């Protein structure tokens, strides 16, 4: 059922799904940078021997396979045995410049920000890719939950890096295998961009909303039916001031994924979704997708890591 609605959501999908040239550039930069951090680590373990860096992880768009046409922002997480500091940031950012040279001749600008507790990497392509390397440590969660240098990195910034890392693991386990979920999220990510009313849902809240709504169905759905179920969900008044709200699965304390929305946003987003639903029900879903009426493993965008 919903053949025509499947045609439109899949064609819109194609329209927003990044190109091989974008993807190939992502693969390259990510691969280069991962393999470079692999060395930056190996180099340290040697200095100590004569641990500190526990791993490198993909998060955000890259990991979730949520890259679309025009996305120039990638992200990684750097795990540190201890609590990352300013000394380690400078040491990594610097040595990273030397280790990249062992993997590629491409030139990357390396810029650090002690405040963002991260190391940004920009390449030289038009437009340029920007990959942010967030440094953090579990020893930080333990501590928030309950005798070190004087240059600890911003706990808030380090705690957020763990959150996204938990979002990335959750997404791969729950959302990925959910049929039409990753597709609906992409096509709805593009709608949150086009319609400023949906803006506030962009990212985590949208991802959760789509997994929840689509996951509560009895059986697997197509892209058409799946997207509808998300409209219905909203149309029911889920994000209204009073009501469950979207509960955050990656939080030990009860957290609302959309608790930041304000009374009017909740009203507008709901009234929009409501209208979008009926439009879909009456064969006008192309209008919700901002397109003209028409006449495998899409989840896997870039290869999994070898280095990590």
């Amino acid at each position: 059922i919903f053949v025509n609605d499947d045609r439109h959501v899949m064609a819109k999908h194609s329209s927003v799904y990044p190109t091989q040239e974008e993807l190939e550039a992502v693969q390259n930069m990510v691969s280069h940078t991962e393999r470079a951090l692999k060395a930056v680590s190996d180099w340290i373990d040697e200095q100590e021997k004569g641990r500190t860096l526990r791993g490198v992880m993909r998060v955000g768009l890259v990991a979730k396979g949520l890259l679309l046409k025009g996305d120039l922002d990638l992200e990684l997480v750097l795990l540190c045995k201890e609590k990352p500091t300013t000394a380690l940031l400078d040491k990594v950012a610097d040595n990273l410049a030397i280790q990249l040279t062992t993997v590629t001749e491409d030139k990357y600008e390396i810029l650090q920000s002690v405040d963002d507790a991260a190391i940004v990497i920009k390449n030289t392509k038009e437009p340029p890719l920007s990959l942010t390397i967030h440094l953090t440590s579990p020893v930080v969660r333990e501590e928030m939950e309950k005798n070190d240098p004087p240059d600890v990195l911003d706990r808030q910034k380090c705690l957020a890096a763990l959150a996204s890392l938990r979002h990335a693991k959750w997404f791969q386990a729950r959302a990925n295998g959910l049929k039409s979920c990753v597709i609906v999220i992409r096509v709805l990510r593009d709608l949150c961009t086009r319609v400023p009313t949906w803006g506030p849902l962009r990212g985590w809240p949208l991802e959760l909303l789509c997994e929840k709504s689509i996951g509560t169905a009895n059986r697997p759905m197509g892209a058409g039916e799946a997207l509808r179920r998300v409209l219905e969900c909203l149309a029911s008044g889920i994000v209204m001031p009073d009501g469950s709200g979207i509960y955050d699965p990656c939080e030990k304390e009860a957290t609302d994924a959309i608790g930041h929305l304000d009374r009017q946003q909740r009203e507008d987003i709901t009234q929009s979704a409501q209208h979008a639903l009926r439009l879909a029900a009456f064969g006008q879903l192309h209008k919700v997708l901002g397109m003209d009426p028409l006449p495998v493993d899409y989840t896997v965008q870039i290869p999994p890591s070898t280095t990590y």
Binding site: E232, A235, G245, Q274
Partner: protein, 332 residues
């Protein structure tokens, strides 16, 4: 279509609440107060019960002792609002379905009606009644209550109808379906809260012409479904689900909606509403869902005058501007 719209109460385990469910005490009080305003007084149910007894008896008799009378009655059933106990004040009318043995002609419908009222008048010459026929049977009413008699026949006679000699096949089939509804209702929807809600939905549909296309039968199935289809019944105020399922397109194209329990094989009750009407019902409930969230339940329940404007006009709820949902259906 095998498509089931979204229902929060069908999969609640997947949406844990973050902060304790707000206190809807006032809402529950108003819901009961209104049920009380709509409920028939003690004078009203006496007059009805009295008239329903009198007539039902005369008919019971005519069935055991057909006498010399040329109208064979095979069965009589109490159906509709009076039987289910969802009656509203001001409308003291009961529905009786009388299944005739032979073909239900226009002459017979008048003979039976006049024979019935004549029996009441022989028993009680003092009480004044009036008896009128129509195209669906006849009516008998006193000074404060009316009993509608819905004529039909034993199915055997349905395939043998005559477009010009007997009553409309549709009318006869409607009366029979009425019997199945009451049977199903007494059997399945006979719950204290279900009956209270159906009375409130009947009121909502009257103050909001958006809900006009909704029939008594759909309302019955909707109230029962909102209360019972989930272990225990849902609290009366948790009414909110009725609006929420209409809003998520339970009665929209492509949706299973509700299947008729009194028909075969898998009929969608909302299939009797046009596409335009479906759209209308939906977007009406869509506005009322939003309006209830803004704490406008006193208006929704009709305790604050007319609110029919809420569904077509912009309203400001505590600084929040509410824009009513609009037509999305396009007549090709």
């Amino acid at each position: 279509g095998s498509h089931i719209p979204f229902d929060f109460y069908l999969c609640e385990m997947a949406f844990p609440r973050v902060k304790p469910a707000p206190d809807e005490t006032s809402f529950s009080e108003a819901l009961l107060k209104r049920n009380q305003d709509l409920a028939p007084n003690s004078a009203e149910q006496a007059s009805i019960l009295s008239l329903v007894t009198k007539i039902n008896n005369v008919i019971d008799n005519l069935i055991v002792a057909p006498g010399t009378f040329e109208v064979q009655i095979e069965e009589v059933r109490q159906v509709g609002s009076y039987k289910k106990g969802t009656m509203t004040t001001g409308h003291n009318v009961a529905d009786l379905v009388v299944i005739l043995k032979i073909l239900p002609t226009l002459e017979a419908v008048a003979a039976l009606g006049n024979k019935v009222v004549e029996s009441l008048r022989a028993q009680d010459p003092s009480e004044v009644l009036t008896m009128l026929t129509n195209e669906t049977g006849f009516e008998i009413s006193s000074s404060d209550a009316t009993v509608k008699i819905l004529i039909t026949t034993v199915p055997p006679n349905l395939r043998k109808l005559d477009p010009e000699l007997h009553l409309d096949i549709k009318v006869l089939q409607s009366a029979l379906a009425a019997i199945r509804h009451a049977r199903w209702f007494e059997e399945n929807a006979s719950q204290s809260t279900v009956k209270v809600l159906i009375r409130l939905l009947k009121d909502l549909r009257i103050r909001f012409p958006g809900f006009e296309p909704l029939t008594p039968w759909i309302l019955d199935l909707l109230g029962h479904y909102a209360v019972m289809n989930n272990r225990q019944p849902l609290a009366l105020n948790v009414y909110r689900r009725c609006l929420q399922i209409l809003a998520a397109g339970l009665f929209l194209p492509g949706s299973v909606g509700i299947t008729d329990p009194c028909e075969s094989g898998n009929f969608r009750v909302h299939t009797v509403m046009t596409l335009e009407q479906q759209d209308m019902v939906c977007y009406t409930a869509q506005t009322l869902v939003r309006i209830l969230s803004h704490g406008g339940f006193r208006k929704i329940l009709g305790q604050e005058g007319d609110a029919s404007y809420l569904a077509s006009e912009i309203s400001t709820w505590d600084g929040v501007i509410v824009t009513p949902s609009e037509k999305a259906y396009e007549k090709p």
